[model samples]
Every structure is written in structure tokens, then in C-alpha cells.
Target: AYFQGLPVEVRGSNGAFYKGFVKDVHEDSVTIFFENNWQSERQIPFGDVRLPPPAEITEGDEVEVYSRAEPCGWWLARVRMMKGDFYVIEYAACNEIVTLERLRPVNPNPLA
Candidate 1:
């Protein structure tokens, strides 16, 4: 239940993204509490879900990743290497490997 009770960004089959929290985890699917809607949750198959980051990433790039620390949020990290579909990242005092989709490059100045 890695996603259980956690914030997640899910992409639908039609390529729309929804922000939600993991409500439940099933063997073949997941239920999401989308956009603070409690009346009903969304269920998506595991194959249709993704963890999004770039398929092509390089070393020495500043990136942000989902934090596992309390009060979870996006935290900055440096790319160290690529291990198949995961990247080895240096966050805080430790190094961890995360999937490509969990990372997004940082643009110091977006307007420029």
C-alpha cells in the first residue's frame, strides 16, 4: 500500500491529470479522493496509473521530488545517476532511488 493515505497525481486514460489522495489500495486498482470530493472516490487500474518524471534525465540537474518526510511536499534534490527507470537522488543527508515520474526539473526563473 505505498500510495495508501498519501497524496497522488493520477493521469487518466484520456490524458487528464487529477490531484487527489489515496483512499484505498486494491490488488489490481486504487481509489482516489479527488479534489477533496468525498461523495465518491475514483478507481483506476494499476496499468493506467503513472508516477511521472521525464523518460530522459541527466546527471547534475536540479530536480524536485515527492518528500516522504512529515508534512509531505516537494523537496529539491540533485540527480546522481540513472538505474533503469529510476534515478539515484541526493536528498537532504541520504541518497535514494525514485522513479522517473516522481521528479520534475526546476526552472529557477519560469518567466524568463
Candidate 2:
């Protein structure tokens, strides 16, 4: 299925991944509307847009929660419990309920 409206991290020319949602999907590229700046939109190549891994996350798995308050917009969180369509995660001594779109597997070795 097309990932339209799903949140993804698009790699920019500066080699940084920015949090955004799939605005439109083309044959070879997708237009992204950034989380921090809705006014800015960029069309990224298909290979540069990182889709969320299949939902294999279970309780106690360490995951990354998308947060606009964080410097890089993703923070470390641990899966707590499954609440219907939402996941309860604990990070920085607090808990938050988030959807699958807002969660990603924690990468121990991220490439620059």
C-alpha cells in the first residue's frame, strides 16, 4: 500500500534526517511536509525516505519516540504496554501514549 499520510524521516541534502509526513507519493519520489515546519515541503527520492520498520515492537522493547521538543526530533523510549491502537512508552521518567507512526526501533549505530 502507498504510505501516503504516514510519518517518515526524509534524508536531506545535508545528510540529516528530518521528521515529516508523506504528503504525496509519486512513481519515484514523495513530497514531504515537515513536522516542525508545515510551510516547508520537499520532494525526496524514494530511497532517501525512511519508512518505519514492520511493527515487531513488543512490550519492553526500546524504541524511539518522535518528539518535536527533542533536538533531533526523536527520543529514546521503552515500550510499556499496548493500549488499543496506541502504545504506552516511557521516556525521561514520563509516559506517553503514541501511535505506531510515532514510534521507531532504536538504532544503536546510526550512520551519518
Candidate 3:
């Protein structure tokens, strides 16, 4: 069983935006039905991916997703129309050029 969500953003002129779980999958496209209306469905091209669609995300599995407008994307993200992933999947901000915790301050070795 898969969990579905809302559409985050509209797709390109040639594509239609969809947000939901993998209801069904074919060789080249993934079917995502609308969260509200499961009857309303949309299919997206696989593009570079050539494998079968994955199952629903588990509570323990670590994952990361893109947020906001990305210049490096082409089409289709996991969950669309979301504020963002609440879970720390990607660890995008885990520790970028910064430390999450401080073991000791700079003055810890005062006698140096």
C-alpha cells in the first residue's frame, strides 16, 4: 500500500502536475492519482530512470527530496505540493560548512 499527497507545483507546458503514490507503474511512466480525488490520475515520463517505481516510504528509511525551484531538475519529484519534507531524509541541512553540536569552545584549552 502507498500513501498519496497533494500536487505541489504545476508541470511544464507539456506535462501535468500530480502528487500521490505509485498507484501503478509501467515501463516508461509512473501513475500518480490526485490525493483528494483518487479517480483523477496523471502519468509522468521516467526520463533518465529506467527501473520500476519504488514502494511507499517507510518511517525508518532515510530519504531526501528537493525543495523550491531547482535549476538542475527536469521533471517529476516524489511528493509534490508539499511545504516540504518534515523528516530529515536528505540531511540537506544536516551540517553544511557548520557544526551541529559543540564539544568544546575555542577557549577550552585556556593554558595553551
Candidate 4:
């Protein structure tokens, strides 16, 4: 994973995948992480790749971060933590291929 993660998308509709704290959450699917292999220069872990955050993500959170890869090893993305029953929505965005979980965000906010 490089400093700038790949432009991950929701596949069908071409919705961009976002990292860090994500707002404007919706049903159908939840924010998650992905193993940035197609276009990443940094190193990453094995199984944990292309998965959701270790903790949990909730709605109405503040996910304002760039770059999907984490620091040091770049194995995982950094998820901004917030309040209540949730740690953060640590996920990667890609517009190339769409997975079952990756869905179009109905009311996606601007990239802050």
C-alpha cells in the first residue's frame, strides 16, 4: 500500500472506496478494508487483507483520512476512532472491482 491508496470503487456504479472515518453510512453494506494489491507499493498482512476493521464501525462517525495503507508496514489502513459501540470504519476505496459488501453509498459526503 502506498501513501496514496488506489481509487477503489463500488464496481457497478463506480462508487469510490473511502478510508478512515466514514460518514453518511447506509444499510445493505458496512465500511470495510481491503488488501490493496492491484495498485499498492507498500507491504501488507496476509488474511487480514481486504476485510473490515478489527473492532467495529457505526453510523454517523467521523472518518476523515487519506491513504489506505497503514504506517510502518502498510499492512492495514488507519481507521479514525469515534464514540459508542464502535471503534471506527477502517476501509479502502476501489472503483475497479466490486465485492459483495461494497455497495454504493446513497448519500456519500464530499471528501473532507
Candidate 5:
């Protein structure tokens, strides 16, 4: 799969996924324009880029939550349960209730 123009999270050397969009597709890599700095671009290997989280996430699913403390602007978390309109997620010894907009699915298969 070609992922051109799709929003994605590219796994950086620091092991954190940063938000970006695929600008160009190659045989083994894709050029990405990062959202944080639109001028910043990189050609990342296919294995290091993934599509945005799915919309139909549920309790007990592993996901990534937006966090200002993380260098990459996001952190991995597990959904503990739902609280009315919010989701209760646990990560790094802390539990937080966040809206769906703050969550993204964790894909085991990067480009699947």
C-alpha cells in the first residue's frame, strides 16, 4: 500500500510516533511532511510509518493518547473503560479520562 496524502504517525529514532502526512510514496519509503512543522520533511521507511488510529476503538484496546509531556507529543495507553462520553485510559502509573479526539489506535502492523 501506497499511503500518499494520508495522515500518519512516523516512528522516529527516539521510538515515538510523530504526526505527519505522506507526501510521496516509494518502493520502500515514503516522504512525510510533519504536522508540527510543515516545512520539516523526511523519507521514512515503510516499517516506520503507520496510518492514524481507527475510529471504532473500544475498551481494553491499546492506544496512543495525546500528551504534552512526551517529546513526540503522544504516549501509549490502554483503555480501561468508558465514562459516559469519555474514555478511561491507564498509562505510566496514571489514569486519565480523555475524549476520543485525544486517542489514536496502536497498530501492530504498521502499514496494514
Candidate 6:
């Protein structure tokens, strides 16, 4: 029943329990703003934290990601992989790995 910004107890990677307040909750972990109990503030992955399935889009899906190149147009991209809140995309033929937001789907099914 722990919610964001509420006091929480999370176990650290070292198998030690920590007391902190929740900063944010991700599909796999919770960002903790520790109350001076650990060596550093961090996001802790709870034991019961089961990773959620990929939503909306996945790797190899054709998409358009925001491109700062021309400052105009959504650049052509392919979903390379996902890390945290970001979708790693490869733009253009250069194959440069660019971390981007605002993914717009392209090449959808013709019917239905």
C-alpha cells in the first residue's frame, strides 16, 4: 500500500534494509530518497518487483522519434531497446544510438 512520497522501507542491493521515502515508482523499482540510512540515495528494486511487459511499442518496431537534427520533422527511427524510461532508438542509416522520447508509430497494419 506504499505510495509515492510516502515513507517506505526498501531492501538495498547489498541485502540490507533501508528506511526512506518513495520518490517515484517504476515498473521494476522505486526511487528512494533515503533518510540518511544508506551510503547514497537510490532506486531500489523490491523482491516482489516483477518487471512489467513492454507496452505500446517494442524493439524493431518502426517509429518516429523527435530529432534535433533539422528541428522540424519526427525523424525515422527503429526501437532498438528499452532502458528505464527511455526507448533506445537507432535513427537514419548511421545506426547511431540516440536516446529519445515522443515515439510515434509508423507503418501500421493497413486494415483494422
Candidate achieving the largest lDDT = 5
Report the lDDT tens digits of candidate 6 across residue range 3-110.
766665443333223346776777877776776544565777766232211246777888765445412334557887877666777875355455545666653322
Per-residue CA lDDT of candidate 1, range 23-43, in tens? 788888788776557688789
Compute the lDDT of residue 65 as modeled in candidate 1.
Answer: 73
Residue 74 in candidate 4, Cα distance off native in Å: 18
lDDT digits (tens) for residues 26-103 of candidate 5: 888888888866787788888887776555679999887877654455677899998677999998425888999988
- lDDT, residue 32, candidate 2: 83
Note each model's CA RMSD in angstroms.
Answer: 12.4, 7.6, 16.8, 16.3, 3.9, 15.3
TM-score of each: 0.43, 0.46, 0.28, 0.16, 0.62, 0.37
- In model 1, which range of ten residues has the least summed lDDT? 103-112
Error of 3 at 97 (Å): 26
TM-score of predicted structure 6:
0.37
Error of 3 at 74 (Å): 14
- Whole-model lDDT per candidate: 0.65, 0.73, 0.34, 0.30, 0.76, 0.55
Off by over 4 Å in 1: 1-56, 92-94, 107-112
Clashing pairs in 2: none
lDDT of 5: 0.76
Off by over 4 Å in 3: 1-18, 48-112
Rank the candidate models, highest TM-score first: 5, 2, 1, 6, 3, 4
Model 2 RMSD to the real structure? 7.6
How many steric overlaps does candidate 6 have?
0
Question: What is the lDDT for 42 in model 4?
Answer: 29
Error of 3 at 13 (Å): 4.2
